[PDB]
Amino acid sequence: GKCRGLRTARKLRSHRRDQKWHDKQYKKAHLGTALKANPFGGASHAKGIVLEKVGVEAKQPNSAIRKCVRVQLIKNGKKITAFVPNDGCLNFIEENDEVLVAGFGRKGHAVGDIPGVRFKVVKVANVSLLALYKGKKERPR
Amino acid sequence: VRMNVLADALKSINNAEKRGKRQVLIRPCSKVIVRFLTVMMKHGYIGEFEIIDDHRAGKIVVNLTGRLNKCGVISPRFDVQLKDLEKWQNNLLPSRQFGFIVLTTSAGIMDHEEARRKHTGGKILGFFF
Amino acid sequence: ARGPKKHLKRVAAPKHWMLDKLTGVFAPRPSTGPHKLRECLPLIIFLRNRLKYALTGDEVKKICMQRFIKIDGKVRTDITYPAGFMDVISIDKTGENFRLIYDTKGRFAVHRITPEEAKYKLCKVRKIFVGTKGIPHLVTHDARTIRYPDPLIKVNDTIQIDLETGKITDFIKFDTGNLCMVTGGANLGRIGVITNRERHPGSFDVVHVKDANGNSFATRLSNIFVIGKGNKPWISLPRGKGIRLTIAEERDKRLAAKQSSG
Amino acid sequence: GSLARAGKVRGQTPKVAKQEKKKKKTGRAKRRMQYNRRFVNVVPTFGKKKGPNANS
Amino acid sequence: PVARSWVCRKTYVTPRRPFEKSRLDQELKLIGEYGLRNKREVWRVKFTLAKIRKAARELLTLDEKDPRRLFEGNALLRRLVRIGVLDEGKMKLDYILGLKIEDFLERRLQTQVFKLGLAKSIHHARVLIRQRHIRVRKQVVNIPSFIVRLDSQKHIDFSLRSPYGGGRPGRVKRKNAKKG
Amino acid sequence: GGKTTGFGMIYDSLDYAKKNEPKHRLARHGLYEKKKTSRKQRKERKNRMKKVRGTAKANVG
RNA sequence: ACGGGGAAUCAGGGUUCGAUUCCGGAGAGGGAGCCUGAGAAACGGCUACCACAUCCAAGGAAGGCAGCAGGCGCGCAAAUUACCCACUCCCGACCCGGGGAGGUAGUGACGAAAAAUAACAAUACAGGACUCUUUCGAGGCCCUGUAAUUGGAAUGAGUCCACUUUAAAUCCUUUAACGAGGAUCCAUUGGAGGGCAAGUCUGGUGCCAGCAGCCGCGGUAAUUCCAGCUCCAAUAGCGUAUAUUAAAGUUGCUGCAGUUAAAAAGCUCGUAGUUGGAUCU
């Protein structure tokens, strides 16, 4: 059982401090290895240069070729695989051009079918993918 | 070993009341136990009790009117101010209509309502409803 | 910081000045002078915010530089001159005299006094010391030094100063049973008879005071200013006689006054 | 896998132009219309399941 | 440093469950019955009533002779009576907990303009207020959410400059009379 | 549109008005004319005069 | 990691944040050392070194925007090289001069408040209204809507005038003139399998393209993809990423667990720690 004494505040506080490190979320947030290992470096978005276009096979229950791009982040130079969400949107991206990439929605975790992909392309050539998909804007020549 | 003889007394009363018995033997007795029992009896929760006088420490036989839903101790005896009494009595009591928090006070051992009447705080001993 | 500060932010100004928050970034930093920065009312606040004789600081300067404002019998042209407790402000052009006297809310009231009362002021003696080959000296809360005071005058007493000549004309001792105002703390601006002084050597003495309505409070000895011998003040008091009504009685009085009109 | 099919279905679907229809009301009028539809006059309420967009 | 004030406050709270049929129906009923623009008006009145209830509850935990309980409960009850939400007979803090959102919704200027016969419907009432046709005492009020006080209720008139309340026919009538 | 609220002063004479009024309120009456230079021109002329010593300061600009 | 006042969230308890306009500290590219002065180890003062860097006639000379604008760079990420000392105050020998402090405008969907995008009437229709224990002979003193139906009224968005505002202006307010019937003066952002409000409607595609936070959908009747129609959620706002709070009684003081789901040391002794029987009017 736990200590119930008027002068056990030190023991209770120290035990909570120690046992908080056994929480995955707390340790990830407060240890610093996750921020060092995070390609964005704690940022919500990041810019990169599209190194190439790749096709990732969906995980076994599903069958599809998810169109991603290998990009290299400008801020630090890391190589990232970023999903290109909608259909035909891979036709908007051209190799060796600027691209704004966000997280995939699960805070550094792969989403759905696409394995090992935790980033998605948000903008290409400083115009959003949603504007290109709907025809609101066009690629700058 | 045994610390907080009041805790043992209250737990024995609780278990006897749950078993439906009409009398419970409490040993050892103490001043705090007697005052707590008097507080419980002034509200009609236990009824008359008797102190068997050994020559070492007291014993008590408490008659049990089947009204006690629960009598419990709070350990440690936290110091309670008047402004903090509502939070304690909202955490410990089943309703605002019945149930009492017992506090030891410079004015005596007494329930939270009478502690409010005397405008005084103290240390929480326990509760009963 | 290096050296002294010269500005006062409007929100760091004393709250009893009742300055608003949107007029500017700065409050008029009181000049150095007889009274402390937080226990004074600058001339600009008095002539602009209280009396509405001016709309801006430029007009306050225009009034002051015509030498129309006297403080304690002397013309002052500094618009941030620190005027404090018991100070007499005379405007001879408009023929009006005021004495800076605390309200029961702790604010300097616009308290108009007769020209005969404007001839003198009460001063709480801050210290008594011997200097200059046996000459006794007295220092008041007003920071004026008086040589050759009465031998009976001690610290915490109250003297009466004739502003024309600036010499002691009378004094009240700090005794139980004497009327006093409170010049600091929670009870600032309250007037009552001193009941008893509990002494704490090496610490702050506490003085208990009883209102004219029977309310008893207590302050530190440094916050007590003896006003009159017995229960009779030696100065005029504001419309509220130092009796601090509770908020319920204030509400009742306001409602009664409002319902009496129309 | 191959990247050849990228805008396959989106490019190969027949392009159907949006029909011209009168503008819908906005603000308090749209909420008034909704309130009238849901609450004021409702005939088909006889103990059966009806949805606002039922196609049957 | 600026001479500006940044005291600002959000006047509503978004519900915890976005798609709840019972709450959606209740809010739509309130909107249609009182001619409200959107759900934020319902949420604003709900937030007002919630803050009032929180204050009343916190006062009801004080001692019945507490100076603060007496003062602030009297002030709160006076404020609720002043806008007609509470009746003068029920001057206890326990009757605050019995108040509904519709009680506050009746006291809007739109509801009173409709209910005093100045408009044919609640939506006509709103467009009348928004078009500077309505005044309370001598002030032309233009805000539909203006909460009418008890003593301002009998001074809601039809504006001395509006075509409905004192002359100068409007743009349309003047143009048509000029045409023929 | 019912009413307009403003502030007003009535001076004992026009001389007191010229002495005590703000210069812009006198200019609204035509009784004052301000400098036609800007802050920029005055500031740069001052900083230019800072570079010369003696009577040559007046021989700037 | 500047500290605090404080901020977000929060039943009670807490958790996270606080570079940021108030108070205190520190610094002025990095160190160091000083002069003057009441006050500085000052940098819109000086001296030197270190880094960078400007002009040069090559001998020398001159530097410090973490001030206000502005530029480059960095990046996911942040505004005008504007006007004025009129206000608030500060400084000076000073009522008079000066102040990128400060104020005023410009940019501004950070965010917060208020609040348009229609209202009404008639007409045809529908519905109820103890309508007679069935068919417009007691069905318009009520109510609804595709109504591109018919009518007049009412308006400010806008444009423009004169005031007002203000140093001077702008804006708001106030007049006046024009300004609405697809009132085309046009509301969007997301979604419609469940969670979770809303279509197993139509066409296309056919484990492809894609959707899908999760479960899942797609292999020829796809309620889930791409579209059309319809619907519904919030609405001048809505979606996404990320951090954080509640949800999390999944950190548990309140208030969690430890037989088998994760878990009690192999077992004892034992110091600190924690906790300790009755009893004194």
UniProtKB/Swiss-Prot annotation, chain A:
Residues carrying 3-hydroxyproline? P61
What gene does the UniProt entry assign to this protein?
RPS23
- Name the UniProt key words of this record, in alphabetical order: Acetylation, Cytoplasm, Deafness, Disease variant, Dwarfism, Endoplasmic reticulum, Hydroxylation, Isopeptide bond, Nucleus, Ribonucleoprotein, Ribosomal protein, Ubl conjugation
Q: Specify the species.
A: Homo sapiens (Human)
User: What domain of life is recorded for the organism?
Assistant: Eukaryota
N6-succinyllysine carried by residues: K53
Q: Which family does it belong to?
A: Belongs to the universal ribosomal protein uS12 family.
The observed outcome of changing F119I is:
In BTDD; decreases hydroxylation of the protein; decreases the accuracy of translation; decreases levels of incorporation of the mutant protein into polysomes; patient cells become highly sensitive to oxidative stress
* Keyword hit for Ribonucleoprotein: yes
Q: Which PROSITE patterns match?
A: RIBOSOMAL_S12 (PS00055)
**Protein's UniProt keywords contain Transit peptide:** no
| GO MF, one annotated term | structural constituent of ribosome
Which PANTHER family does the entry mention? 30S RIBOSOMAL PROTEIN S12 FAMILY MEMBER
* Subunit relationships: Component of the 40S small ribosomal subunit. Part of the small subunit (SSU) processome, composed of more than 70 proteins and the RNA chaperone small nucleolar RNA (snoRNA) U3.
Taxonomy, top ranks, is: Eukaryota, Metazoa, Chordata, Craniata, Vertebrata
- Report the record's Gene Ontology biological process terms: cytoplasmic translation; maintenance of translational fidelity; ribosomal small subunit biogenesis; stress granule assembly; translation
Q: What is this protein called?
A: Small ribosomal subunit protein uS12
UniProtKB/Swiss-Prot annotation, chain B:
- SUPFAM superfamilies, A to Z: Ribosomal protein S8 (SSF56047)
Positions carrying N6-succinyllysine are K87
Q: What is its main location?
A: cytoplasm
GO MF term list: RNA binding; structural constituent of ribosome
The signal peptide, as residue positions, is none
Gene Ontology cellular component terms for the protein in this record: cytoplasm; cytosol; cytosolic ribosome; cytosolic small ribosomal subunit; extracellular exosome; membrane; nucleolus; nucleoplasm
State the UniProt keywords alphabetically. Answer: Cytoplasm, Diamond-Blackfan anemia, Nucleus, Ribonucleoprotein, Ribosomal protein
Q: Name one GO biological process term.
A: translation
Source superkingdom: Eukaryota
| Subunit comment | Component of the 40S ribosomal subunit. Part of the small subunit (SSU) processome, composed of more than 70 proteins and the RNA chaperone small nucleolar RNA (snoRNA) U3.
NCBIfam families in the record? PRK04034.1
Record's disease association: Diamond-Blackfan anemia 20: A form of Diamond-Blackfan anemia, a congenital non-regenerative hypoplastic anemia that usually presents early in infancy. Diamond-Blackfan anemia is characterized by a moderate to severe macrocytic anemia, erythroblastopenia, and an increased risk of malignancy. 30 to 40% of Diamond-Blackfan anemia patients present with short stature and congenital anomalies, the most frequent being craniofacial (Pierre-Robin syndrome and cleft palate), thumb and urogenital anomalies. DBA20 inheritance is autosomal dominant.
* Family listed: Belongs to the universal ribosomal protein uS8 family.
Protein name listed in UniProt: Small ribosomal subunit protein uS8
Q: Which organism is it from?
A: Homo sapiens (Human)
From Swiss-Prot, chain D:
Give residues where N6-succinyllysine occurs: K48
Which superkingdom? Eukaryota
Record's compositionally biased regions (Basic residues)? 20-33
The places in or outside the cell where this protein is found are:
Cytoplasm; Nucleus
- Which residues lie within the region annotated Disordered? 7-33
Task: Outline what the protein does.
Answer: Component of the 40S subunit of the ribosome. Contributes to the assembly and function of 40S ribosomal subunits.
Question: What does the subunit section of this Swiss-Prot or TrEMBL entry state?
Answer: Component of the 40S subunit of the ribosome.
Q: What is this protein called?
A: Small ribosomal subunit protein eS30
Starting at the broadest rank, the lineage of the source organism is:
Eukaryota, Metazoa, Chordata, Craniata, Vertebrata
UniProtKB/Swiss-Prot annotation, chain F:
- State its role: Component of the small ribosomal subunit. The ribosome is a large ribonucleoprotein complex responsible for the synthesis of proteins in the cell. Required for processing of pre-rRNA and maturation of 40S ribosomal subunits. Part of the small subunit (SSU) processome, first precursor of the small eukaryotic ribosomal subunit.
Protein's name according to its UniProt entry: Small ribosomal subunit protein eS24
Q: Where in the cell is it found?
A: Cytoplasm; Nucleus, Nucleolus
Q: Give the family this protein belongs to, as stated in its UniProt record.
A: Belongs to the eukaryotic ribosomal protein eS24 family.
Q: Where is this region: Disordered?
A: 27-61
Lineage, top-rank taxon, reads Eukaryota
Tissue expr: Mature tissues, such as adult brain, skeletal muscle, heart, and kidney, express low levels, whereas tissues and organs with significant populations of proliferating cells, such as fetal brain, placenta, bone marrow, and various glandular organs, contain significantly higher levels.
Q: Which organism is it from?
A: Homo sapiens
Name of encoding gene:
RPS24
Specify residue ranges for compositional bias: Basic residues: 36-54
Within the intact protein, the region shown is 66 to 126 of 133
- Share what the entry says about its subunit structure, partners included: Component of the small ribosomal subunit. Part of the small subunit (SSU) processome, composed of more than 70 proteins and the RNA chaperone small nucleolar RNA (snoRNA) U3.
